[PDB]
C-alpha cells in the first residue's frame, strides 16, 4: 500500500477483494501501511475490522475522514484495469476512491506543519448491509469519542461535488384489522381495506414540507410504498396493511418525525388500526456556514454545493452532534452497477481539493 | 333409479360419484331411468351431460325444474349412509337433494289430470366450475326455447325454505398507473398507489342502495376485496390496482349496473387510471306478486321465505325473462363441506311442497 499517490493506491484497494464479510484483508493491510509507515503523533485503532486513526497537534477545529471499506458482491468486476482516462472496475466509485483520497490526504497531512486541523480517519466495515453491522454503529455504541470532531466527511462518490448532509428516514407499517364475511353480505363483516382510506386520503393529499439550510434547500417525502390486502373475490378481507416512508429535513430528529407522521395522520385514535416503526434514522446537518467548515466551501465552490435528499452513514455524525457532508469520487450512479466507471482524474482533482482545505 | 320414492332416489344418486367433468354416469342414468319408464306426452332430450324433458298439456302457466347433477371434488364422503334420520355423504345437500326431489315430483306428476302447470325439467352439469362449461350456459347459447318457462325453481339447498332470487354480481379491476422514482425524490416520479386515493375514499364512504320487492328487501354490496401496491421500500410504485366487487338488486341489469359504479367512481376522466370487468352476471327477480307464484306462496309460508344476496343459476333463467327462487333441501351450510349433512326428513317436506303448489 503506497499512500504516497492517490491513483495508485485506488487501483490498489479495488485489486483487494472486499465484499461485506470479507473486508478483512483489506483492513489488515490497511492497519499495516499506517503502521510500518510510522507517522509521529499519529494513533492507529483497530477495531473489529474497521481501521481508526488520530492526531493530537492541539490545534483548533477537528475534521473527520470516514469511509467504508467494503463493496457490493462481486460481478466480474475485478481485477481493475485504467483505459484511456478511466478505471474500470468494483469499488472504484463507491468508496475505494475516495476511501484512496481519505487514506492518502491523512498520511501526507498527519505531520505536515501546515495541517489546520486535527484529523480522524476511520475506514470502516459492512456499510452495505442491515445497520446491525455497520463498522461507523459499533463504534458509536463502544467507542464514541473516537467520532468526536467539528466537521465529518464521508467518501462516498459524488463526483468531486459536495452532497450537504442527509435527510432523514423513516418507514411506519399501519396495518388495519375488520372481519371477514361473504362480499356479498360486506354488513355482516367489517372490510379491513377500506379502514385505510381516510389515512390513504391524507398521504395522497399531505404536501411534503420543505425547509432552508445554509443556502441550501431540503424537501421532504411522505409515500406509501407498499399496500396489500385481500383474500378472495368474495370475501371482505379483514387484513390490510400498508409501508408509509416518510423522508425529514435534517432540522428534525426521528422522535418529532415520528410524532408528525402520527399526529398529521391519526395513527392513534382511529379503532381498529395498528401501527409501528419498521426503521428509523437521523438526519444530518451541513453546517456550512461554520469557520470550521469555511475553507472547504472555497475549495469547491459555492455552485457546487446542493443537499443530499437520499440517507448516508452521514447521519451516524450529526447524531453525534457533528455535522457532515457527502464528498467523494466517481459518479453517484454506477453505484452498485457491474460495470462501475470512475474518471481517474477525479481521484486527483478531490486529493487536491482536500489538501486546500486543510492547509488553509 | 326409481323415481317413485324421493329419499331411496337421493340415496341412490349420491352413491353415483358425479364430481365436474364424470357427471357422465349419473347423467346416462337419468336419461334412461325417464326414456325406459315411459311417459306420454313427456319429450326426453339428452344435450352433452344434460337431460331435459318437458310436458305439453297445453296448460296456463309452466313452472321449471332445475338443478345440477354434479359435486365439488369428492373427499371420503362416499358412499352415503344414513344415521338415524339424518344422512351423511356428498351432494345430499349440495342438489342431489333436491336434484332427487325435482326429478322425482316430475315422474309422477307429468301424467297426472291434476298437474296445474306445465313441467320442464332440467339437470344440468357442471355448475362448480367457471362460467364457460355450465350445462344451463350452453343451453341458453344454443337451445333457449327449452328454457321457456313462467317461473324457475333451482334446488339450491335452502333447507325448505324460499330463497328468492339473487343478486347481480359485478366484479371491475382497477389499475393505476404512475412512474417510479426513489422514495426520496418522489417528487420526480408519480406515486400510483396514491391515485387509487379519491376511488378508494369514495368506496369506503359509499352507502349500498337498498331496494324492496314483493315484501323482499335486498340490500346491495360494493366492497374492495384486493388491493396490491409496491415494489420496494425506497421506491416509488408505478402501478397499483384493485379488485371491486358489486353486488347489486335484482332490478339492475349488468349495463347498469357497470354505468353506476363508473359514474358514482369517475372511472373514466381520471388521468393514468384503467378499467375493466373481469366477470359480470344479472341478478334474478322472484315475481312472487304472480299467479303463476301463488300457490308456491301458500305452501311453504309467506313467513319462510327470505332474499337471496348471493348469487345462482338462477339468474340465467331471470334473464330470459323469468321469474325464479332458490328452493331445496339440506342447509345451506354443509355446502361444499366434508361432510354434507341432510336430515333426511326434509326430502319428504320439499317433495310434499311441490305437489301442493303443482296440484292447487
Ligand atoms: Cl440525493
Ligand atoms: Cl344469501
Known amino acids: ?25 483489506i483492513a489488515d493491510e490497511i492497519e499495516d501501511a499506517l503502521r510500518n509507515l510510522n507517522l509521529p503523533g499519529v494513533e492507529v485503532f483497530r477495531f473489529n475490522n474497521n481501521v481508526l486513526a488520530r492526531t493530537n497537534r492541539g490545534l483548533a477545529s477537528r475534521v473527520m475522514l470516514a469511509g467504508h471499506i467494503d463493496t457490493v458482491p462481486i460481478a466480474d468486476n475485478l481485477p481493475s484495469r485504467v483505459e484511456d482516462g478511466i478505471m474500470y472496475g468494483c469499488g472504484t466509485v463507491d468508496m475505494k476512491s475516495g476511501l484512496a483520497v481519505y487514506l492518502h490526504t491523512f498520511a501526507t497531512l498527519a505531520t505536515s506543519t501546515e495541517l489546520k486541523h486535527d484529523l480522524t480517519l476511520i475506514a470502516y466495515e459492512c456499510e452495505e448491509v442491515a445497520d446491525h453491522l455497520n463498522g461507523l454503529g459499533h ?142 434514522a ?21 455552485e457546487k454545493i446542493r443537499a443530499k435528499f437520499g440517507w448516508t452513514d452521514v447521519s451516524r455524525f450529526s447524531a453525534m452532534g457533528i455535522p457532515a457532508l457527502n464528498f467523494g469520487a466517481g459518479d453517484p450512479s454506477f453505484a452498485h452497477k457491474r460495470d462501475e466507471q470512475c474518471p481517474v482524474e477525479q481521484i486527483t482533482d478531490v486529493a487536491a481539493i482536500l489538501k486546500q482545505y486543510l492547509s488553509e
Chains 1, 2 share one sequence.
Not at 6 to 17: K, N, S
Open 1 to 25: 500500500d503506497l499512500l504516497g499517490d492517490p491513483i495508485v493506491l485506488t487501483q490498489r484497494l479495488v485489486d483487494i477483494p472486499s465484499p461485506s464479510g470479507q473486508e478483512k484483508q
Open 139 to 280: 463504534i458509536r455504541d463502544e467507542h464514541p469519542e473516537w467520532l468526536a470532531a467539528d466537521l465529518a466527511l464521508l467518501g462516498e462518490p459524488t463526483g468531486g461535488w459536495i452532497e450537504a448532509g442527509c435527510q432523514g428516514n423513516l418507514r411506519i407499517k399501519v396495518t388495519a384489522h375488520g372481519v371477514r364475511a361473504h362480499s356479498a353480505r360486506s354488513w355482516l363483516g367489517d372490510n379491513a381495506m377500506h379502514k385505510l382510506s381516510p389515512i390513504i386520503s391524507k398521504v395522497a393529499a399531505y404536501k411534503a414540507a420543505e425547509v432552508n439550510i445554509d443556502g441550501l434547500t431540503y424537501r421532504e417525502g411522505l409515500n406509501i410504498v407498499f399496500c396489500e390486502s385481500g383474500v378472495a373475490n368474495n370475501v371482505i378481507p379483514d387484513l390490510a396493511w400498508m409501508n408509509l416512508n416518510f423522508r425529514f429535513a435534517p432540522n428534525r430528529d426521528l422522535n418529532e418525525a415520528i410524532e408528525h407522521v402520527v399526529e398529521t395522520l391519526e395513527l392513534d385514535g382511529q379503532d381498529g388500526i395498528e401501527w409501528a416503526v419498521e426503521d428509523g
Open 282 to 302: 437521523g438526519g444530518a446537518l451541513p453546517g456550512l456556514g461554520q469557520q470550521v467548515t469555511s475553507g472547504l466551501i472555497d475549495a469547491v465552490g459555492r
